[PDB]
Design an enzyme around this catalytic site. Sequence first.
Site, short mmCIF file in Angstrom:
data_model
loop_
_atom_site.label_atom_id
_atom_site.label_comp_id
_atom_site.label_asym_id
_atom_site.label_seq_id
_atom_site.Cartn_x
_atom_site.Cartn_y
_atom_site.Cartn_z
CD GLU A 11 -2.22 1.35 2.91
OE1 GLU A 11 -2.50 0.22 3.42
OE2 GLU A 11 -2.67 2.44 3.36
CD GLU A 22 -2.47 7.62 5.78
OE1 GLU A 22 -1.24 7.42 5.88
OE2 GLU A 22 -3.32 6.88 6.30
#
Length: 215
Positions: A106, A110
């Site tokens: 992944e 963010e």
Amino acid sequence: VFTHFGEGFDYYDSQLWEKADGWGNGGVFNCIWRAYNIELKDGILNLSITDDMPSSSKPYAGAEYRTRDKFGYGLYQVRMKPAKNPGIVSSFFTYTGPVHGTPWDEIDIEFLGKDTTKVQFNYYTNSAGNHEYIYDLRFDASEDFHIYAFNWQPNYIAWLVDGEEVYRAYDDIPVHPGKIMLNIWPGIGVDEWLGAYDGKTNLTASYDWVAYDPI
Ligand SMILES: [Ca+2]
């Protein structure tokens, strides 16, 4: 077979995208995902945090919107405006995981709602994370749409903001192709990282478009 992907959020097509609904990630994610906190309006994807249904195990309902298909090396771009509030995260990331028969690989952009003049870059490779890097934006990402990207290569990941590369990482780079996922969520037990969430209602992260180009 990876090919150009473009999404403008004009209409929900169940063959291409999936509105996450009735599960949460657990752990630090203090919400269940609700298909009803996803809205496509006027070509903008709106992901919201609201108060969850009475019978939910969590206090809050988040949103997560995810491609049906998976993508490989190349340039992943989003035009988005994260939400600003203590204790939340607005995200653009790729994800595959043990459930799909692969290691947890992944790559993350963010926005920590506690301070939207910064972005956090991160990645997980065979579940191993701890590659956090906080880039100072020198604008407030919550006030306007901007273009964020990572170019994921075999030997590195580069992240970019408004067309320019601002960070690159070399260590233990992800391998297995993942879905593109957009989310917004309130944290718990992570007051140091996110700040405490304060239950503030109807926070929305908005997304104008996403693109992937195999390069
Ligand atoms: Ca659009």
